[PDB]
Design a protein around this ligand. Structure first.
Ligand SMILES: C[C@H](c1ccccc1)[C@H](N)C(=O)O
Ligand SMILES: C[C@H](c1ccccc1)[C@H](N)C(=O)O
Ligand SMILES: [Fe+3]
Ligand SMILES: [Fe+3]
Lengths: 119, 114
């Protein structure tokens, strides 16, 4: 009766990303969604970027969260300017902006989610 | 740069729930997103059924797969979900969830879909 998805994450290729990105919401789920949502736990990603700088033609939000504030930190490169985000934080990356992030600090249970907004 | 750090945003929903994305952020968003860490939600024994006028997605995650577990009550049917899991609650459906098990760093996010 209910619509449940547990074949997760869905690996999808994203521009500049070395490996497929783990998606938990995709545009085709449930008859159609206005967002896609990818990302994961950061504790094993400190110092290791998941992508080269890249551009989308949709807006992307970085959602950085951790069990306690301040336990996670990423550096977002935005058109050659570096911004440090401290959990909890939400950053909007406008479509067409060159961008990527580097994990600076993360405990177990720190996440960064990328949310592609459908336009 | 557009960065929001005054988070979570306490909003009343059917206590205030902690929101990390609200509909008015960044000139308007097609979703709202609430939720929080589940390790401190294992202990309370009850949850209240409620209804929204939009679809809500439950998004259940944990640092390692299988480390978090909830019961989703949907119109009198009990569903036991294990992380990672996403469940769609159609608008108008009476629903709630109860946390059965969670390691530190497990989350359930409620995503209201416009
Ligand atoms: C969606 C994708 C992503 C976000 C967070 C974690 C993994 C992958 C994004 N394009 C990016 O890395 O900026
Ligand atoms: C917004 C609220 C919530 C969802 C997930 C996590 C915390 C709070 C939701 N209405 C529900 O509990 O179903
Ligand atoms: Fe991106
Ligand atoms: Fe709800």
């Amino acid at each position: 009766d209910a619509e449940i998805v547990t074949a997760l994450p869905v690996p999808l290729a994203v521009a500049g990303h070395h490996q497929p990105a783990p998606f938990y919401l995709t545009a085709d789920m449930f008859g159609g969604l206005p967002v896609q949502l990818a990302g994961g736990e950061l504790s094993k990603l400190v110092g290791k970027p998941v992508a080269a700088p890249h551009v989308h033609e949709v807006d992307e939000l970085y959602f950085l969260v951790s069990p306690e504030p301040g336990q996670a930190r990423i550096e977002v490169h935005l058109d050659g300017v570096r911004h440090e985000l401290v959990s909890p934080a939400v950053m909007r990356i406008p479509a067409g902006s060159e961008h990527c992030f580097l994990t600076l600090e993360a405990t177990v249970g720190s996440y960064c989610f990328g949310i592609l907004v459908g336009d």
